[PDB]
Design a protein around this ligand. Sequence first.
Ligand SMILES: *C(=O)[C@@H](NC(=O)/C(=N\O)c1nsc(N)n1)[C@@H]1NC(C(=O)O)=C(CC2=CCN([C@@H]3CCNC3)C2=O)CS1
Length: 622
Amino acid sequence: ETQAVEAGEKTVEQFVQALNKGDYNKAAGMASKKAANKSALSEKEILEKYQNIYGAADVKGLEISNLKVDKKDDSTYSFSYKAKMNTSLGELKDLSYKGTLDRNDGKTTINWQPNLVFPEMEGNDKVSLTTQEATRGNILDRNGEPLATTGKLKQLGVVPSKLGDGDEKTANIKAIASAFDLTEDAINQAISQSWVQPDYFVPLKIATIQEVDGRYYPLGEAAAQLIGYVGDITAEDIDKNPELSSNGKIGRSGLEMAFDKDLRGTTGGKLSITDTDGVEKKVLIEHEVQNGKDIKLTIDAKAQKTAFDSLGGKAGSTVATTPKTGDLLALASSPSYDPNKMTNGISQEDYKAYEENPEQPFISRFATGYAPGSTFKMITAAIGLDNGTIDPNEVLTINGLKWQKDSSWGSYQVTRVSDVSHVDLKTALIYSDNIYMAQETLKMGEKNFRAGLDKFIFGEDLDLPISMNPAQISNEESFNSDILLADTGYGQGELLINPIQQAAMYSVFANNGTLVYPKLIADKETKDKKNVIGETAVQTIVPDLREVVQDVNGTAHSLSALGIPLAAKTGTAEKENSFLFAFNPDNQGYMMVSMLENKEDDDSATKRAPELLQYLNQNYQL
Ligand SMILES: *C(=O)[C@@H](NC(=O)/C(=N\O)c1nsc(N)n1)[C@@H]1NC(C(=O)O)=C(CC2=CCN([C@@H]3CCNC3)C2=O)CS1
């Protein structure tokens, strides 16, 4: 407790603090002159040491404790303290520093020595710092087949110096643009790029070829919206997260981005003290690299490749689930983009292409909310049946195509397409009679309609890694209209449900009225919501839904040619959308929901479903 002691106690601290602030020169100013019993190096020689070592290892957050300064002679005090510090590779704990001070004319300074960098350093000792980036994990389908993996790829390229001079170049460019099937002009824009030197290898496809490590998506565009793609890491990404290395790739969309942490692993590293020849003398930190985790999904890659191909590139979406457990067997969206071109290199043209396609390939339509249309009637009936409103056999008598409750609906008319004039429940679903449904809905009223709807999952967010707004009944918490109460009853109005949310609500017909939440991660436990509708309302509706197919006038009669047990409902909306709902009523092994955004003349979701239905029907039973 002496005013010379604490003068030295303060001179240590100002030295430590100067190193935290990274002011390696202020620190160097507190060094005794270079001498045999004082410092071991000059101010400049000291400055350089800390910049080399404390900088290259980014030493910061230096905390000392148990500081001691005791007198040894009138001009020399000995100090000692414990310390901990943060390095770019971890925390250094329980360091033991020791040294001496030089009092001379009321000026107290440090007799610097290498053992104030790290305790065990001596003489001409140095420091080494090595890092090892990890390998990105895989995304797998339910059967282990890979959906996103990192492997060696046969990169094709050329060398401007092994071509032709004049006609031998512009005719040889022809030959390699053929045996590989790529445009011939793009070989000229590439060869004449800025960075090209006539000796470098210039890449073309995913004439010499070299093996390159890259990120590969076997299914390409058939699963590009769900799985996503990955991009070069940019300086900005490191601002958002300085734990990233400049050399990896990063998930930018779809599941790659949703699970980037798990998939990307942790970097390994090693901080060592070496003699003057890089020979390791003490290891201070060693974190063995930990690679990225694999991720197993519910997807069935054949169902996905089939479901996407079935849309023939038209705007639309398909979604398949095993309804008794929630497994999502496929999440198709069309049109689409090449996720391999995006990740591993995409020409400036093929890229500008996707951006201006007005049907928007980058949209994950299976998460876009739509107005479901007539398919929804299978709910409305099930609610009406639950609360007594609907008599299956009560036969309404309905004339013409238009209708309204009374003249106070101005020009708002409920329209249908088939002038059936004796409609019971079964007949209503077989023909998709908006009117019958619009009526039996009003017979039920917002209170009893919402009483049933509210037993579903509107508003809720599902436990899935896909960004999607929840499904809504209306753009306000009440309808505030009869017309809307009606429009909503037959699948329009202010309804918004996306193909995954639809597939969840309709699961009630495969589970005696229990709703089963969708499942996308292979291991996660099934989650359900019991008694959403009555078992009896199911046994009433389903046999009517078979007849949407079998009956010669059924909206989906074309599917009876297949010879497979189907129960289903269709839809259409107005540009014209087209819908289909389908599942197996014998075994409940699968269920599908297919849309067609902006259909073509005489095209339909129902005309494209068979190939996917045959696969599902055979490979998913009990
Ligand atoms: C349910 O979605 C209903 N569709 C419509 O009424 C719509 N347009 O057709 C629609 N509602 S709102 C809005 N803006 N437009 C019924 N569903 C279907 C269907 O599922 O296919 C309809 C089409 C349709 C029923 C029977 N069809 C036979 C084809 C040849 N002749 C009849 C048929 O195309 C309309 S009613």
